[PDB]
């Protein structure tokens, strides 16, 4: 999340995100999607 | 110095006037270039 926030701060000034930035964002967001799913499974079934 | 301060209460590091019980006078000092060199405390109030 901190890395994604830093990328957002970098690309916030520019009007249009370039292809390299789009690829990096896709990579980071896919990894974050995996992590969320993992945490979800850890608690999905009632696990106090 | 002050991480917490309840509103309406007196806390340290605050400049304040000590009005006497008559509500028209306060705990003050000599006026200006006095004979006591501003070293005697009084309850003159009023203009001060």
């Amino acid at each position: 999340q901190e890395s994604i926030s830093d990328f957002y701060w970098y690309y916030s000034g520019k009007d249009v995100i370039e292809e390299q930035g789009k690829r990096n964002f896709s990579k980071a967001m896919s990894v974050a999607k995996q992590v969320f799913n993992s945490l979800t499974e850890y608690i999905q079934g009632p696990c106090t | 110095i002050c991480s917490c301060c309840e509103e309406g209460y007196v806390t340290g590091g605050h400049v304040l006037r000590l009005f006497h019980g008559h509500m028209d006078e306060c705990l003050t000092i000599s006026a200006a270039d006095s004979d006591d060199q501003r070293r005697l405390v009084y309850y003159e109030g009023g203009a001060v």
Binding site: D6, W9, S12, G13 | I1, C2, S3, G13
Partner: protein, 134 residues
């Protein structure tokens, strides 16, 4: 266990420990007629009471390096390591900064620190880093 947050007063205390006495001091700056800061002894309060009127700095905000650079090119937070803050003297209402003057002939590399009237520029911002390994 309280965490340093924004919009609060600070003393910026330090320990001198000269003559193995563990003296505690803080930065003091009047701001009118003199912008330079100096160390005042907060210890030995029983003999003489030190003045804390000019030793209070309200912290404006804590911001990340990238966002700081962005706004330099162009509410309440919790401080954390690797971030820059702005300090504003309570009395003079001006921001603490790093002056380009050098009053210390001993060290050429040492500039000066004082209060500046406005927060323009990055000389007023100061970044924190963790002193301890923990």
């Amino acid at each position: 266990v309280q965490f340093l947050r924004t919009d609060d007063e600070v003393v910026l205390q330090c320990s001198a420990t000269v003559l193995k006495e563990q003296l505690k001091l803080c930065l003091a700056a009047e701001g009118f007629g003199n912008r330079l800061c100096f160390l005042e002894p907060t210890s030995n309060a029983q003999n003489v009471p030190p003045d804390l009127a000019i030793c209070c700095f309200t912290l404006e905000q804590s911001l990340s390096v990238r966002a700081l650079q962005e706004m330099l090119a162009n509410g309440h937070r919790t401080l954390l390591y690797g971030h820059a803050i702005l300090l504003r003297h309570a009395h003079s209402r001006m921001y603490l900064s790093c002056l380009t003057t050098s009053r210390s002939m001993t060290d050429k590399l040492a500039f000066d620190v004082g209060l500046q009237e406005d927060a323009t520029g990055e000389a007023c911002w100061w970044t924190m880093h963790p002193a301890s390994k923990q």
